[PDB]
Design a protein around this ligand. Structure first.
Ligand SMILES: [Zn+2]
Ligand SMILES: [Zn+2]
Ligand SMILES: [Zn+2]
Ligand SMILES: [Zn+2]
Ligand SMILES: [Zn+2]
Ligand SMILES: [Zn+2]
Ligand SMILES: [Zn+2]
Ligand SMILES: [Zn+2]
Length: 284
């Protein structure tokens, strides 16, 4: 016998059955503002509980990774893909793991903003209780992790993401004398748009990088040179435009670039709508 309870981002599995049974299954979602999941597994005195994967403090299951490394087993028959680390599933830099609560086992997973992926992710963890050749029951928990939002940071650095909820609107960016640079980071999941960004932009009227009509940058910046763009050379997924401060246009112009999911979780594109303000002192 198995029982799963879920309220917000806290899940509890509780384990004398009529017959045997598939894993009791449920889900929860982590995102900005709901960054901590908890998982508890408890059983009556005669049952031993294990987790799936066997070490939850090191690994989670990727149901998408089936051809593999080590398989995530539920019961004698069941499978939920393969063991991955969270940092690998999330494609992020910081080591992130479920943590045992020290003080009926319970675990906590706390994401930080920097842990939020560029694309929508899901993983699976579970508990299995074995009777004293013994009978099992299990709970299966799917945790969906929503992609970070595409965003603008100081010094006009754009972080693009591609999740279902990542791109409600274009990211609006101002350039002017005091703010004469633009950096676009597509990450390894994305590609700079237009592909010809070193010479061209997308006409801004579409407000959507997915509807990109290319036009030459010289048409709006008469002094434009290709050298105004520098691309990260090992990383061709980031580039920075620097308009020399005396070379800003004499009238306001607007252009669009961005990041599209790479020509191959990632349903949306990142549109960056740039307004170039002539005769503008942002801080004064
Ligand atoms: Zn942190
Ligand atoms: Zn921090
Ligand atoms: Zn990826
Ligand atoms: Zn062209
Ligand atoms: Zn002027
Ligand atoms: Zn100024
Ligand atoms: Zn301004
Ligand atoms: Zn400022």
């Amino acid at each position: 016998t198995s029982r799963l309870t879920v309220a917000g981002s806290d899940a509890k599995c509780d384990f004398p059955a009529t017959q045997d049974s598939p894993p009791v299954s449920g889900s929860l979602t982590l995102s900005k503002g709901r960054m901590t999941a908890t998982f508890e597994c408890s059983a009556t005195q005669a049952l031993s509980i294990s987790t799936i994967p066997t070490n939850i403090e090191q690994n989670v299951c990727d149901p998408k990774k089936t051809t593999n490394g080590t398989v995530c087993q539920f019961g004698a028959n069941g499978s939920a893909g393969t063991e991955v680390t969270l940092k690998d599933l999330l494609e992020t830099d910081r080591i992130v793991n479920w943590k045992v609560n020290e003080q009926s086992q319970k675990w906590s997973l706390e994401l930080h903003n920097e842990d939020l992926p560029l694309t929508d992710k899901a993983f699976v963890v579970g508990c299995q209780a074995t009777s004293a050749s013994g009978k099992t029951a299990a709970c299966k928990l799917t945790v969906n992790v929503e992609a970070r939002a595409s965003s603008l940071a100081e010094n006009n650095v754009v972080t693009c993401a591609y999740g279902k909820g990542s791109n409600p609107n274009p990211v609006e960016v101002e350039m002017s004398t005091e703010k004469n640079t633009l950096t676009i980071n597509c990450g390894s999941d994305g590609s700079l748009q237009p592909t010809t960004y070193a010479e061209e932009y997308c006409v801004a009227d579409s407000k959507d990088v997915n509807r990109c009509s290319t036009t030459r940058f010289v048409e709006i910046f008469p002094k434009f040179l290709k050298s105004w763009w520098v691309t990260e050379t090992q990383k061709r997924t980031s580039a920075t435009l620097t308009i020399p401060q005396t070379d800003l246009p004499e009238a306001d112009q607007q252009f669009l670039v961005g990041c599209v999911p790479k020509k191959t979780a990632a349903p949306t594109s990142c549109t960056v709508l740039v307004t170039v303000k002539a005769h503008h002192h942002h801080h004064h």
